[PDB]
């Protein structure tokens, strides 16, 4: 697992054997994390991460999407 | 529509007749738009419009998954 990965849960998330619902509150917690990060400061680093986090959870998506297309 | 949302093109993503998968190139689409605010500078400003970003997002899917689990 990245950082990203880990810190935000993702790491079985395109398991098509996760249910829509439960995927969507993988999600939802992932992005209020990012909102949380973006809440405190625009320092660079901060920024970095948040970025980092969102570019994680959108690579996270497609793979479920690919999963879950295969069936 | 809030600027958010229309920007985000989310205002029908809670809509159960949508797919898992095209919900998924919905929030993909989304979160790309994020990484890209937050790959170019860290100015107050984009933070925090990617932070509306982040935020008006996770509203919607919490809103999705409500509509989801309805049925």
């Given at each position: 697992?990245?950082?990203?990965?880990?810190?935000?849960?993702?790491?079985?998330?395109?398991?098509?054997?996760?249910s829509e619902v439960?995927?969507?509150?993988?999600?939802?917690?992932?992005?209020?994390?990012?909102?949380?990060?973006?809440?405190?400061?625009?320092?660079?680093?901060?920024?970095?991460?948040?970025?980092?986090?969102?570019?994680?959870?959108?690579?996270?998506?497609?793979?479920?999407?690919?999963?879950?297309?295969?069936?």
């Open positions: 697992d990245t950082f990203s990965e880990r810190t935000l849960g993702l790491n079985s998330i395109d398991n098509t054997e996760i439960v995927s969507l509150g993988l999600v939802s917690s992932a992005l209020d994390k990012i909102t949380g990060l973006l809440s405190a400061d625009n320092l660079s680093e901060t920024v970095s991460q948040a970025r980092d986090f969102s570019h994680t959870l959108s690579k996270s998506l497609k793979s479920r999407a690919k999963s879950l297309s295969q069936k």
